[PDB]
Amino acid sequence: GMSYVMCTGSFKLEKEVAETQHGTVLVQVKYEGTDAPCKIPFSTQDEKGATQNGRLITANPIVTDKEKPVNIEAEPPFGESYIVVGAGEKALKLSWFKKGSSIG
């Protein structure tokens, strides 16, 4: 076990966001900062911004080597959201829309 900072640099989207069979998205990011190894900040934010719910499925997303892209799986909220990877301005913000509602 070890003690890491939250990544402070920029993330780029490495390829198109993919959508799984079960209401989640697969996002592959490339880190451009200089503090690896580091923990990837992750939040979901509002169609106007705000602190909207949602779920990070990936256990503990980490940049181990900045040259290696990282896969992250997330469950966005229903309706319009941003899936945000990184901290601050220059956070990677991914627009998303999820139709419907929970079943059952």
Classified as helix, coil or strand, 9 is coil
**56 near 42, Cβ under 8 Å?**
yes
Residue 74, both tokens: 């997330």
Nearest residue to 45 (alpha-carbon basis) of 93, 13, 8? 93
Asked how this structure was determined, the answer is X-ray
Query: What is the spatial distance between Cα 9 and Cα 70, in angstroms, rounded to a whole number?
Result: 14
For 57, other C-beta atoms within 10 Å of its C-beta total: 14
What domains can you pick out in the chain, each with its CATH number? Answer: 1-104 (2.60.40.350)
Query: What is the spatial distance between Cα 88 and Cα 73, in angstroms, rounded to a whole number?
Result: 21
Residue 19, both tokens: 């959508």
